[PDB]
């Protein structure tokens, strides 16, 4: 398309999910040249949807994959490769260098942001149209981070949530509103949310909704709802007792709309939700202590009701298999009356639970909604840690 995108539709009814994309990265990367990645996501241009992830500068099999448990180094880069290919050395494309990213297409071209540097002197440079436009230095000197899933734009404005400061406390979260890679405005986190990490966002009907991570005290997730037209936001938590961070305490009967739900402290996992009244689905790990399994539950009015319990559900990865990061994306340039809600799950593999190998890496499963009620299967990464020995 050659004109800015405007979020003029609402979600479609979510009555089950169907597979959209599957990688099989780690099973193929046992013999081919696949790159070690982590923090995946998916994002669509008007033209194509592509898988996106943070790379580690080595292939699974090469000797340099030893040590990729580590989150940030100067050999990480945000790459892109076609939907359902593995992230190969030969078909990947680097969008920028850094260890935390977000990227989105405003309708005319795309914004990609990589953050880089030492933990006390990190920088973000915002690439607009494969050229570096603006950069932002750190403001609280402690690991400036950002989304790890796509940003969303409305008429050229693309809000992006950044956090800088402790992960075990108060930190400094700001919402930036870029347009054509330039900073129109920015604001501090405002709302009842206590800490913000790795927001997963989608937009419909001119409003952007982000479901995030409270790493400091939450087991229920902060929601930030942004108005890209007035460039303002509010934050609250999901009211539902169906707790969705991980690790988590056991689900209560009454949740907490304005406060962290108490139980696990100083930990979390990136996660998403489609919050649309009765049409609300939530994703969560099946395990309470670990990144294993992944289910999607329909919990109507979960955002506002502190007694919301599931009414339909769907198993995406069995609890006997590993899951990991999850986030949302939508094909905004898909034809039709409404938007088809989609999500991805990161399937982490390697260190530290499967320490027999010295790499950590992952693969991708993505699903998108249907209105049919479709049968469910589960979707394992699939590799045998024993053939890499």
């Amino acid at each position, epitope marked *: 398309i050659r004109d800015f995108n405007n979020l003029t539709k609402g979600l479609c009814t979510i009555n089950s999910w169907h597979i959209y994309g599957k990688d099989n990265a780690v099973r193929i990367g046992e013999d081919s040249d696949v790159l070690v990645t982590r923090e995946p996501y998916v994002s669509c241009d008007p033209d194509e949807c592509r898988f996106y992830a943070l790379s580690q500068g080595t292939t699974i099999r090469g000797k340099h994959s030893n040590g990729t448990i580590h989150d940030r180094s100067q050999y990480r880069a945000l790459i892109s490769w076609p939907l359902s290919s593995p992230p190969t050395v030969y078909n990947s494309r680097v969008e920028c260098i850094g260890w935390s990213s977000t990227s989105c297409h405003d309708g005319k071209t795309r914004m990609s942001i990589c953050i880089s540097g030492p933990n006390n002197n990190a920088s973000a440079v915002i690439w607009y149209n494969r050229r570096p436009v603006t950069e932002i230095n750190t403001w609280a000197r402690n690991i400036l981070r950002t989304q790890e899933s796509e940003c969303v734009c409305h008429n050229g404005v693309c809000p992006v949530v950044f956090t800088d400061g402790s992960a075990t406390g108060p930190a400094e979260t700001r919402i930036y509103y870029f347009k054509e890679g330039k900073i129109l405005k920015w604001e501090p986190l405002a709302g009842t949310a206590k800490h913000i990490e790795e927001c997963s966002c989608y937009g419909e009907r001119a409003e952007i909704t982000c479901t995030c991570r409270d790493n400091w005290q939450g087991s229920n997730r902060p929601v930030i709802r942004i108005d890209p037209v007035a460039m303002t936001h509010t934050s609250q938590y999901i009211c539902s007792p169906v707790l969705t961070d991980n690790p988590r305490p056991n689900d209560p009967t009454v949740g907490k709309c304005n406060d962290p739900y108490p139980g696990n402290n100083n930990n979390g996992v990136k996660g998403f939700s489609y919050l649309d009244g009765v049409n609300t689905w939530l994703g969560r790990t*099946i395990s309470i202590a670990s990144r294993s399994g992944y289910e999607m539950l329909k919990v109507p009015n979960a955002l506002t009701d502190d007694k919301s319990k599931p009414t339909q559900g769907q198993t995406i990865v069995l*609890n*006997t298999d590993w899951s990991g990061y999850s986030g949302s994306f939508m094909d905004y340039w898909a034809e039709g009356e409404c938007y088809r809600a989609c999500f991805y799950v990161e399937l982490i593999r390697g260190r530290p639970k499967e320490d027999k190998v010295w790499w950590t890496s992952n693969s991708i499963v993505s699903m998108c909604s249907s209105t049919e009620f479709l049968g469910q299967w589960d979707w394992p990464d699939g590799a045998k840690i024993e053939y890499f020995l």
Partner: nanobody
Amino acid sequence: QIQLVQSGPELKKPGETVKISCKASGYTFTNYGMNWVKQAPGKGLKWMGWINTNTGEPTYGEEFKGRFAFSLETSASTANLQINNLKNEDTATFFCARGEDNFGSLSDYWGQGTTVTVSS
């Protein structure tokens, strides 16, 4: 709700084999694998391995790779421990524990124990 009820305690002379059952109740067998733990008379608690009640693949602790064999009557929600060529120092109590997650890092819900006394 969840009950893991184990077989009763056996006596076996050295060299014999034993099959200890663990019948699961209250959960869907298939989404939660089984931990087998040995609490030896003095020594305390030890992880013997975990069985993927979905695929059926067992992991053995290195101490247990060999004479020990995990299997399951899937169909009846039973997991079983089989210790072949019983050694006299295998007298102890074996617990099946449900593993909360993949690999069983958490044993929420343990069975009653089946105590073996290897003795001529």
